[PDB]
Amino acid sequence: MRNKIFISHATPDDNDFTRWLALKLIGLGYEVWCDILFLDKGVDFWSNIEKVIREDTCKFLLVSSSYSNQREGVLKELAVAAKVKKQLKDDKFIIPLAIDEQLSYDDINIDIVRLNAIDFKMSWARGLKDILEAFEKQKVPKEVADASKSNLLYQQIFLHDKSVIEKEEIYDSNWLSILSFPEELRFHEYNWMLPKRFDVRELTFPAVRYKNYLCTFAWAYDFTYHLPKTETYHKSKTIRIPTEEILSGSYDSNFIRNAECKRLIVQLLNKAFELRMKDKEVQEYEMSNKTAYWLEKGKLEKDKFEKTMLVGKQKDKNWHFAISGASKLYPFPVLMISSHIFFTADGKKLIDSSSVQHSSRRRQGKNWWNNTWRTKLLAFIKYLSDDDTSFYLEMGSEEKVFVSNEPVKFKGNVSYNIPEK
Amino acid sequence: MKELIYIEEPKILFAHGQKCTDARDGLALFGPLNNLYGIKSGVIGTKQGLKIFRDYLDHIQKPIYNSNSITRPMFPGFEAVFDCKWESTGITFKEVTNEDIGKFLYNSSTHKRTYDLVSLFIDKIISANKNEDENVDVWFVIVPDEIYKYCRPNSNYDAQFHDQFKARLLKHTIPTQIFRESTLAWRDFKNAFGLPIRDFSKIEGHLAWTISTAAFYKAGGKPWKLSDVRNGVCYLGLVYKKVEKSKNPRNACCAAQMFLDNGDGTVFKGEVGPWYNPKNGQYHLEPKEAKALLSQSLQSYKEQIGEYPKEVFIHAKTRFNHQEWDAFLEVTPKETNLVGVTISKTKPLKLYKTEGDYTILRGNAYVVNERSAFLWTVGYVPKIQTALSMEVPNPLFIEINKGEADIKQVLKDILSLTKLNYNACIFADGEPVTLRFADKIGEILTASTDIKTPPLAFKYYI
């Protein structure tokens, strides 16, 4: 018995309305046939089209758009439709559905001009109501409406190739793990023998002020040259605290709180990173709250490290990849590197216009994707390496912290498929 | 290496009891949750503005496709998707002569001219609402471009047109939508080069989708509410704003945005006081204001539902100190569980895929510990085959600052809270809705410092 309602159209341009009406009608209680409903293909498609048109189809709507007016498939289906129309003696077997305004009345195919066209050009809902009225008048058998079948069909035909798959992936971050730390942190006895109002930050080996004492990663007698006034220090008044136990966080004494000690270590690491990259002949740019370091044009050959394009040109400007440093603990000891893009004109002198710099940063970064950022960050990390495995960061005369040059890897269990287009 | 867990995308409920993961497809396929008879429209502006609004209203009825039909699905038409009659006939029009606009457009003092233009709109709005026996749904204020160009800061009340306009009607409860002439008629408006100022030829369908969703919501209907729900759970978001005009630098104002299942939130206004510390730059409340705000929150919840909530979440951008939290805990009934979470975007951890130019999939999370974790809410998605943001995403830092709650449930809850934004029918947003509108609400409520209003629905603010 004939219950299937055929839709003919040109593909893939007319897929939108075809999908809409088919889904609404198949959720309304009817049964609809069209090319894009199955996604199986291969079973002698023309013979199947003949079989459904001649044997199973009840009504036939042709999308009388500009493209579908004379396409070979549409014309062939229309010829078979005329044959079966003469067979079943149904004058209203063919229903045109004009879906555009640019098709002139003279242009429409001769075989469909005579038949009454149900309007779909002004509004789709009124056209759907007209079609529903036509189907009530022509008394097509049907059951109750059910949109869950529409949901299932949309999920299984059109939400098929864009799902979540269980695939392993390896992601690279921008964090450097600290391998080893000095054995002990030393607090000295000063501020009665250094001059008052002293800026210890300008000293070579970094140090910080803690009320009476002086907190630094250095022995007692390494500051003689900077402060000749302090040569009288006796090496028996330096309190030493293991660093590994601070990392464990189990220290607790009236002298220092654990959080304050960790903050002092963070400041020391920040300063040490600052001077260590000062030694590596990279230019500095003082941002609003941090300092970012970049490479001058021509510092490295072809402005490239290995196979990464670090310094480039955009229009009448030169853009540089720059990095800024910071430290943190208690995920585990970590150093962060933050990426930035800066601009110049002559290759050495920065542009003093902040708004122009921001606009150029936006314009250049709009065309940078994940692979570019990852490769540039990896190349800049590798440029600072002293060994093949890690690079040292100075703590004192005989104290260093060795930071690995490979960021921490992350393992993911869910992935997708790269789109064809 | 470190392992990443996966959090599945939540589903939102739609018409006929069906659930979808994208709101646009569900709307175009099933329809909105609650349907109205039709939209009774009111427009105030010049005659040309009325003509432009009428033309656009007739235009959005026709189907309108987009260049990339897989990322930005097509718009069948307002009657087709929302099943409501938003027609260009039978609308109430109020006329503003160009001479009146020119009378106040040429004033030197920016604050003064902003005040006069706002009042010139507001008096007409209130007179039309009061004198007429007609019951208009929403008021569409179509404004010429020159006013917006000349009603912005640096061009005792704020110097922005949108914020002032939304603030002054807070006491009258009048839903208003502000449009420029250049947006509704982008094709007509051209530069000296002959090109349009605003090129919407590529995202016309998405623009119509957003406008239709906003108009349907502000008229009274609910487009969508999320499907997989925990019963009796409320969300609270705190907002602080330093008042610039105040002589004392420490004066600050607080507000609480309250959300339920439905995504139609309420706004509670707090008392202005010294909440800002200029030393370390963090905001904190005195005990009395905290008690008042929380008491109003659960009073509103009891009024809306009838029973005390089983759980309460207080999302904020900064950690809570002890006196604030014990003041908060003073008021809450003992049968309810309180959680206080902090969400901040300032943690610079970026994950890079080893192969392919695409970024990390959205939804992956790295749980640091049972109290703190990351969450990638703005990563890549396969549904539309394009990530939501450019460059490389920065994840949200979710740390349970106070109270005891499972971190995984909090992660799923915060991910679910990203699908409720009626102002834009988009796939998702990178910030939870409880904190997405912090700046807009704060500026709007600061624009008027004499605001003494009861709790109001969200549509009166946005």
Numbering used by the authors:
A (entry chain C): 1 to 421
B (entry chain B): 1 to 155, 201 to 507
What does the paper say about this structure?
Short prokaryotic Argonaute proteins (Agos) are associated with NADase domain-containing proteins (TIR-APAZ or SIR2-APAZ) encoded in the same operon. Target DNA binding triggers tetramerization of the TIR-APAZ/Ago complex by a cooperative self-assembly mechanism, while the heterodimeric SIR2-APAZ/Ago complex does not assemble into higher-order oligomers upon target DNA binding.
We were able to build the structure of most regions of the TIR-APAZ/Ago complex, with the exception of the C-terminal region (aa 419–452) of TIR-APAZ and residues 161–200 of the Ago protein. Although the majority of the gRNA could not be resolved, two nucleotides (2G–3A), defined as the seed region, could be clearly seen. This observed seed region is much shorter in length than the seed sequences pre-organized by other previously reported eAgos and pAgos. In the TIR-APAZ/Ago–gRNA ribonucleoprotein (RNP) complex structure, the Ago protein is bracketed by the separated TIR and APAZ domains of TIR-APAZ protein, which are connected by a helix (aa 146–158) and the following loop, termed here as the bridging region. The TIR domains in both apo TIR-APAZ/Ago and RNP complexes are catalytically inactive, but target ssDNA binding could efficiently activate the NADase activity. Therefore, our structures presumably explain why target ssDNA binding initiates the dimerization of Ago proteins.
